Symmetry: C2
Subunit: 211 residues, 2 copies
């Protein structure tokens, strides 16, 4: 009887579990709306500057419009991939995943666990995940590293992930395509990428927690 009630509690907890998935999808959609909104404003501003510059400075006006096109192109490209499922890669899951890739590659995985980033958007998590996966894939294909260190830090208004390997960088002076892919999606989020290849390869990727 309570016997049978405890049953209904679990059916209830099971449906709450599925429903929470919808809630994460609702959160991802919201993140899309916020980002599309901001890019829409930015484009607004740049096209307005361009209009004010059509006579004063036509070449600068063409440059602003070219930045408008690029913003549009790359916004649609990042949303396109997400819109049907409204699901991305979680950072906890990717971190596990790259551990497994490193183990199969027999490259030692160094990770010191510290405060996990608390209030990161599903969009920005997906971006950082895809970048971490790309940085580590590269470690495995190209570095000949013996170790690979991942640091994930919640700094002030930003999350910074560092992937450092102690192999050798095999790219040219102008290796700028996984690498451009990373830079684009991070700059789309108002973040950044830095590469040091001086002794091993160090990628630092930074992304605002929100907007």
């Amino acid at each position: 009887e309570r016997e049978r009630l405890e049953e209904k509690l679990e059916d209830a907890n099971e449906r709450i579990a599925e429903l929470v998935k919808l809630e994460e999808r609702q959160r991802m959609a919201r993140d899309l709306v916020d980002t599309l909104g901001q890019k829409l404003s930015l484009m607004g501003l740049k096209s307005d500057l361009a209009r004010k510059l059509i006579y004063k400075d036509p070449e600068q006006a063409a440059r602003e419009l070219k930045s408008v096109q690029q913003t549009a192109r790359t916004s649609l490209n990042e949303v396109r991939k997400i819109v049907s499922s409204m699901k991305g890669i979680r950072l906890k899951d990717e971190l596990i995943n790259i551990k497994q890739i490193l183990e199969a590659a027999d490259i030692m995985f160094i990770y010191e666990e510290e405060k996990w980033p608390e209030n990161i958007s599903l969009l920005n998590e997906n971006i950082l995940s895809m970048c971490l996966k790309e940085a580590v894939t590269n470690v495995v294909k190209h570095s000949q590293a013996k170790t690979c260190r991942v640091d994930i830090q919640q700094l002030w208004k930003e999350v910074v992930i560092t992937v450092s390997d102690d192999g050798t960088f095999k790219g040219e002076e102008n290796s700028f395509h996984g690498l451009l892919g990373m830079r684009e999606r991070l700059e789309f989020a108002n973040g950044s990428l830095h590469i040091d290849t001086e002794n091993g390869t160090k990628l630092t990727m930074a992304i605002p927690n929100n907007s």
Copy 2:
């Protein structure tokens, strides 16, 4: 443990409609982003060939950006809008209170209309009928809701008298803006009574 479960399920189920409204915003914002992409590109191609036409396209880009953000702004937090079935009932009730005769011949209900576009049409219908009650002195108000080919058309016709000037273009501008946002339209005939036709694409 049990009581609270279904109280949590009872709300989280509401995400189903909210999740739909959010996809509708993402789709609309996407489209307006593309359209701004295209217009700014045409503007760029015209900087030297036709500067004044370039300026015009960029002004259209600004407008599109402004009004888009204005429509979304109101919906984003709640992700909830008015349903057309519920507004139809509501305007019945306003007309009854106003003692204006509500004429509605029921026909095929629009089947595949976006929540966003429903919310727009609802707010336009509510405005049209509010106006009927405040200004028309009509005895009848007829509302027609028609699924035409790729568009839904709602006609609100009263047999009172139009009290506005020649340039009454602010509920009316509100209507025209939000319908043009959705790629729809508004027409007013005030010849004998006031007739508003509002049209919006389904998706």
